[PDB]
Symmetry: C2
Subunit: 171 residues, 2 copies
């Protein structure tokens, strides 16, 4: 049983919400009308979102304790929905193309990459995820805006958002 606990104030204090296994599209529909400043992931990997219905900024939440919201990459204490990643594939592999609809020079990866320029990659047009999930970041060295990629096809920049500078495998 995969559990996550969200707290109102930093350092695990204040009112809380315990979520075991399930996916929550609306915190308000589950009684939680407050902000979220600290998270405790006991098991499993989750992705929390800024707005309800899984919209807005994405924040990856792997096993561990996050004392402040800055720890999970959140500018402010807003999180209105959370879901669990329950399907992970064996050998991670992602192919990123320099142009739209999977055209141009391709760059395959199967492990972390702190800087995409090092692959000779000029721009990120489309992305193909053969096995993952993978987590991408707006800036180098895995920092900034997060974008979660699951097994599938991402034809344009708007399928995940424009820049993408770093990536990392199965979370």
């Amino acid at each position: 049983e995969h559990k996550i606990i969200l707290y109102e104030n930093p350092n695990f204090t204040g009112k809380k919400m315990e979520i075991v296994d399930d996916d929550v599209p609306s915190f308000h529909a589950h009684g939680y009308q407050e902000k979220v400043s600290s998270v405790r992931v006991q098991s499993g990997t989750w992705v929390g979102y800024q707005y309800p219905g899984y919209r807005g900024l994405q924040y990856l939440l792997e096993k561990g304790d996050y004392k402040d919201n800055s720890d999970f990459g959140a500018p402010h204490p807003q999180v209105q929905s959370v879901r669990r990643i329950r399907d992970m594939q064996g050998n991670p592999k992602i192919i990123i193309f320099e142009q739209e609809n999977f055209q141009g020079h391709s760059h395959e990866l199967s492990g972390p990459c702190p800087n995409l320029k090092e692959t000779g990659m000029e721009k990120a047009g489309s992305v193909l995820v053969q096995a993952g999930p993978w987590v991408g970041y707006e800036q180098a060295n895995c920092k900034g805006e997060q974008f979660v990629f699951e097994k599938g096809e991402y034809p344009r920049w708007d399928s995940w958002t424009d820049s993408l500078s770093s990536l990392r495998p199965i979370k």
Copy 2:
């Protein structure tokens, strides 16, 4: 029990995938690497999305049969993830404000509205959903781009545009 079946070619032909209760963030992970042109919803309300992980254009799917993809509002037969709406509230109520962060003139609704101009509403800045879910449309008479609204707060236009392509919202409709 909640079931939906997605088909490859129009009119319910070709390879298929049946989904019972569960939520699918990735069709590819579930073995389905093809397009989707026709859908058959036997029970429950679902929301299908263009890209994996619930991104891109949203498509509401209520009980019924959709022979072609144009029937569910899909420009192209691309659907890579689907989820079920399993929590609906009693008396639907939505309040839409004319500016951001819930400021300005408010306009409350509890039933369908084919045209928001009729409420004296000029622009849609923020949305508060007290009970739903509600489905919004980019054009009048419930047509165009779809946006699903669940119980919560929507401060800016970008809170309802996963594809930040259009800031207008012209019609709304209750519990699907």
